[PDB]
Amino acid sequence: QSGDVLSARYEIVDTLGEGAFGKVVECIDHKAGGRHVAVKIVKNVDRYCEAARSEIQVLEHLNTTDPNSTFRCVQMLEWFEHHGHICIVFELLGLSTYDFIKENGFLPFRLDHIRKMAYQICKSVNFLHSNKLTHTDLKPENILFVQSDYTEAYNPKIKRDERTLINPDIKVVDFGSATYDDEHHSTLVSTRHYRAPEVILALGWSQPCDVWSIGCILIEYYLGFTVFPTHDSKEHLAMMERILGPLPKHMIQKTRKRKYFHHDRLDWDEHSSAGRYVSRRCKPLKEFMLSQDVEHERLFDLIQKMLEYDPAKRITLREALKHPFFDLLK
Numbered sequence: 001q002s003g004d005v006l007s008a009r010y011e012i013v014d015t016l017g018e019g020a021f022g023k024v025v026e027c028i029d030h031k032a033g034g035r036h037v038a039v040k041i042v043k044n045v046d047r048y049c050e051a052a053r054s055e056i057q058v059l060e061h062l063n064t065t066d067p068n069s070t071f072r073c074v075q076m077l078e079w080f081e082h083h084g085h086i087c088i089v090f091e092l093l094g095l096s097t098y099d100f101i102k103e104n105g106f107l108p109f110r111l112d113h114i115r116k117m118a119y120q121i122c123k124s125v126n127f128l129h130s131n132k133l134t135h136t137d138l139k140p141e142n143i144l145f146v147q148s149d150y151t152e153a154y155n156p157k158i159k160r161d162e163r164t165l166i167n168p169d170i171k172v173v174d175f176g177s178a179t180y181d182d183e184h185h186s187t188l189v190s191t192r193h194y195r196a197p198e199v200i201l202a203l204g205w206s207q208p209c210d211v212w213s214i215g216c217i218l219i220e221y222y223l224g225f226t227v228f229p230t231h232d233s234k235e236h237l238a239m240m241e242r243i244l245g246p247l248p249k250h251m252i253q254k255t256r257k258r259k260y261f262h263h264d265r266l267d268w269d270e271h272s273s274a275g276r277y278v279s280r281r282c283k284p285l286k287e288f289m290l291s292q293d294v295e296h297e298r299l300f301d302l303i304q305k306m307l308e309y310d311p312a313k314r315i316t317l318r319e320a321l322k323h324p325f326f327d328l329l330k
């Protein structure tokens with residue numbers, strides 16, 4: 001729907017992202033010199049309208065507490081209605097971290113970039129957690145670069161051109177599923193590959209489910225692919241057990257998802273075809289490390305701690321923010 005105009009000032013010029021909820025488009029602002037903004041145009045459908053209203057209340061709250069985006073939540077500039085669609089105007093950001101890695105052929109991010117991006121992500125999400133909020137849908141498509149500018153450094157190992165990030169500063173976007181401690185918790189949150197085990201087993205969740213998501217995100221940034229290449233719940237659990245060891249017995253006894261379990265163990269045949277697929281694609285976590293130098297070890301020590309099964313034992317983002325992995329940033 002390009003060349004179209006919203007609120008009589010925002011001319012659509014391009015589509016930046018598409019979603020369950022609707023789309024995000026790039027607009028010229030005819031009333032602000034023509035400089036460009038992002039506009040999230042939400043579907044004309046209850047569940048998405050309520051998510052948009054909820055997102056707007058969350059952002060108003062965060063903009064008020066942190067109007068300078070010290071904690072790197074995306075800045076909402078205004079909102080309105082148009083042919084019944086909720087429209088949210090945001091600062092124009094660059095590419096998502098997913099789209100960047102994709103455009104770069106699924107080459108992983110350099111470890112110094114991961115360091116910084118992970119710090120910022122943990123700072124942002126901890127700010128949410130300090131304000132009684134759980135984001136619930138952290139993933140690379142929701143971490144965006146402030147400006148996604150690169151240079152064209154040739155590398156002879158890959159023997160092929162690659163893109164290096166001028167500046168890897170990010171923002172966290174998408175607060176449509178963000179949930180307060182006191183509000184109703186959805187039964188199923190997160191995108192599947194970033195989804196914590198307590199969510200899969202329907203044990204209830206809070207702030208620690210976002211930490212699991214972040215652990216998964218950092219693994220993708222480091223490898224360039226997910227360690228959970230699945231679309232099935234029980235397999236996904238089988239992949240966790242292969243990467244992280246058995247699930248804790250008390251999580252298994254607490255669950256009502258009995259279909260996944262036989263006696264009090266995961267009902268999984270390692271000799272099935274799905275069993276071979278898991279064994280082939282997944283292996284103990286630390287075996288994914290590309291080097292043994294201590295910086296890589298500390299990343300993986302943090303990763304491991306983020307991917308603690310028991311949400312009560314999982315590391316908090318407060319603790320994460322002082323992890324040895326982050327020192328080289330001072």
Ligand SMILES: Cn1cc(-c2cncnc2N)c2ccccc21
Nearest residue numbers: 016017024038090091093173174
């Ligand atoms: C490219 N892009 C995507 C989103 C966005 C926001 N909320 C849910 N999903 C999204 N894809 C976004 C927000 C501000 C600026 C640019 C943006």
